[PDB]
Design a binder for this molecule. Sequence first.
Ligand code: FES
Lengths: 460, 461
Amino acid sequence: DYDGPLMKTEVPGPRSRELMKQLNIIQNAEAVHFFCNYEESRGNYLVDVDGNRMLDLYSQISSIPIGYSHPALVKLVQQPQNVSTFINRPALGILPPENFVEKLRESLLSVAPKGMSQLITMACGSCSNENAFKTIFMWYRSKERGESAFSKEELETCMINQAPGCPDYSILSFMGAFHGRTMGCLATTHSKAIHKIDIPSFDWPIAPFPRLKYPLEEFVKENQQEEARCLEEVEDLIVKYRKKKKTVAGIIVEPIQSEGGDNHASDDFFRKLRDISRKHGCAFLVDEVQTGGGSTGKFWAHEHWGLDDPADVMTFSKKMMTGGFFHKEEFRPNAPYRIFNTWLGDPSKNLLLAEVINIIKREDLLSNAAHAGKVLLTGLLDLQARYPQFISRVRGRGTFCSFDTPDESIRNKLISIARNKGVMLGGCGDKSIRFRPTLVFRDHHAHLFLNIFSDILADF
Amino acid sequence: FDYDGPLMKTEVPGPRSRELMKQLNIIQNAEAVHFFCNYEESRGNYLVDVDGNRMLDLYSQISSIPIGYSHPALVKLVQQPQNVSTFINRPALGILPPENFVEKLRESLLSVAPKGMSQLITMACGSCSNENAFKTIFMWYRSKERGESAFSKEELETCMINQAPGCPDYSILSFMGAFHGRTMGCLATTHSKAIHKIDIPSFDWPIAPFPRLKYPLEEFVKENQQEEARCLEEVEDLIVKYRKKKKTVAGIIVEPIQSEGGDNHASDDFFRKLRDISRKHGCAFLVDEVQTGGGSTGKFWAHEHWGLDDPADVMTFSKKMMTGGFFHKEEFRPNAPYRIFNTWLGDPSKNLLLAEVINIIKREDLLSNAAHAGKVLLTGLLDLQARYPQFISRVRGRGTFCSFDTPDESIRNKLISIARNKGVMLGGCGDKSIRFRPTLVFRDHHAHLFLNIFSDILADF
Ligand code: FES
């Protein structure tokens, strides 16, 4: 792709600021950071409307899998036979296209997690998780009622939002979690107050997620004890909510908590959590919406746990272009029209995804993520050694890396400075800086960032 | 743009469809699948399946295809080299919009904004449209109550752990028979069929009766007036009841025509009065036009029939509009960013297509066409109703948004099955209703193609 970044103005520049003013008329546009020229963007480089070309290590909140304007995807749109897929969107649940199954074989089914033979598609991460919740609730009621018909009382009360038709079951989630913002998802989200405030919720159990101490090899015992404490509280919560007649039907967790501030835990913790879930008859729901797609060095991050039975349900979106969830055969809905909506994804996204997965495989991009990520993490550890007054808790897996700054203002200042220097970084939590490079992020991009950021720290 | 009429080769689903349905059933419950389709050969009003059957489609992918299959104007868009990026570079629209984002909105959604609603946020589907409409309404209501006070310390603390006062116990009032989506917030306001709701945790929110009109309308003028008045009273009683329960109604959601519940209509007067009740109790009035929106009732938005300068506070849309989202009044604008947000907030490629759809709707006078084609369709249905009272009752509609009842679910399903094999795709709704959702290039001559086919079916039934 491009050789390096190229800056012409401060960001946002005059043209971005004019467009931001226009947009702010019709909606709150305070979140916009600048306007983009995607036609001129290529690979790891994002071009804005003021002609600035920045190395993008945020990749549209970790949703761009193989870079901007990838030539393989360009070729797809150029093919006359693919026109119909872009302009004839089906109600997939009732009238799928002829190639629906074969395109699924070329894409999502070719990367199915272990033990999960079932797949339903969805259009985003939020309806992926919402429908995973519903799939779990249905499965749990199925266990309880066995091979029996719905009762007349259930059929009548569910229509008016009452038990027993509408059970008071719960999903257990973790502090620091982010699972989406529709009202079901939002109940399991515990990232920032501004995400949650003034919105009605569910009285569902909330467990602590381990806060590891760094550097890791100095706090081995403390961290295992921290993880042990959290696992105990999960089990206590499950028991407590069963007593409250609010049975925990499932547990949802991210393999790495993203929006909450890139919180990591050992593979051992997740294996033990998986066991706790099974032990109490809770469905284990793993949210790979952000970790999925290969940046951790394996296609799904949970693959690092080395389990033949990693989970019951697994959701995905972002890098996968389409959303959806894999699940075990036993979680298959017993009747149609229970897990359903108009579009259930989009065949055009499946078309693109199939080519993305082909590229990832052909070009060995999973291995590349591991390699480039190590270069990045090693460099971050060096800068942490050299600038302890600015950098701490350097952590990561693959390119999925992050570190903390002393406070929020410094975090924001560093991001602002880096952006004007031609590097786009993301923030998470109060004072963390995170990396979500696309999968065509290579060694030399890592070296480029490190050398730019090193100069930034020296001048800071 | 065109085929002559339907052309059938096999029963539906045919052998190739049944084979593909068998394959799909391995990886997921595929019992809902009607058949597999050849969209490449589908054109205008006609859906072609994998067995070569060509059917007149009066269901239009659950009322979501706006100007028919493989429209040449949309073909042209995908063919243009300058549009490639829009299809393969999907932005996080909330933070990094494309250069043409505002202008393409001016060409599309903003050019059909409802009266009194200066604000617009885009969403990817009807469910997240309604969910975020709810949230916008909750934040607005809380903002009313705390005035200029900042977020209290207790609110900021409790909201992180799903507790009041940070998470208020406010409610959205909805109607029996309603359908607003299936995510857990939406679902609480949905009251369509049991199979949609059963075994899913819900919210204790007020549920009002939706008027059940009696037909023919001109023979039940007094009764229908009284029915609507009854429902309006019960709406108001519920708001008061739930205020005392400390589960304050922050908003009221309603469809201008109930779809999935069984194509239930109500007078323009009813909705005007409901709007007034909403305002009176300080509830936001949220109109769900996900299915009624996009022109099939003869006006772009169905609520336009009401004739109000202030028709609602918030209005959601999707399906025919290609993208979802919601218009709303300025006073409902979120005070801070990242409260109404998600990764994609729609998709610029859908906005690209929608701008051209809206261009076609205006240039080909398709709003007026829907009113005309719909009148022809309805007149024919009323004739079949007079000729076959053993099978057809309560013929009703506005524009092409038409429907009628059959004696029972068994007969309803049989008629749909026979019609499909005779080259016409129909939809069902409610217990025993048959509904029509033709695309906007449905013409009076397509109405007659259907009517003549269905007339022969009824004669042999
Ligand atoms: S909720 Fe996922 S696209 Fe609307």
